[PDB]
Structure 1
Amino acid sequence: NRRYDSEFQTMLQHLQPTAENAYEYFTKIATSLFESGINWGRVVALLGFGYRLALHVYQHGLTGFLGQVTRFVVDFMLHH
């Protein structure tokens, strides 16, 4: 059951969320969605969005730290 990952990804790249505003953006999305109606598929889709929004925000920070760590180690092997 993976049919929606390409769409979930394109949505997150359109939104361009950060670690600070991801939860605010998510709660606004969740509220407008459930105020217009709640059903099994919408709860699954929202939780699916929620989890991938968390991975989107935090993989952004992960690749950054990995870049800093790797660039540092090779820098020390370069000058020293």
Structure 2
Amino acid sequence: STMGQVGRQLAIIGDDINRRYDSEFQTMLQHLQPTAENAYEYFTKIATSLFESGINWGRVVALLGFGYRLALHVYQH
């Protein structure tokens, strides 16, 4: 039942993560204007340049979220 307590604190963290950077993702997507024909190439090099300048869990998270929004952007366009 303490599993709910820890689970509730992750819900706050995740909901805070979900809204804190959601706007910053869409700004990049508008400046990128990605399509199905360039999404893979855009994503792969962006990932390489991000990680070759350093990698940590937060950067992995930021890239995962970017890739998720990038996929949503391409599906809707």
TM-score when normalising by structure 2: 0.75
Offset, 1:8: 0.2
The 5 Å alignment of 1:39-50 reads: 39-50=56-67
The 5 Å alignment of 1:1-80 reads: 1=17, 2-60=19-77
Gaps of 5+ in 2: 1-16
CA distance in 1, matches of 2:74, 2:30: 11
How many residues were matched structurally? 60
**% identity of equivalent residues:** 98
SS of 1:48's partner is helix
TM-score when normalising by structure 1: 0.72
One-letter amino acid matched to 2:29:
L
2:14 aligns to what? Answer: none
Gaps of 5+ in 1: 61-80
CA distance in 2, matches of 1:10, 1:57: 15
Bigger Cα Rg = 1
Offset, 1:59: 1.1
SS of 1:46's partner is helix
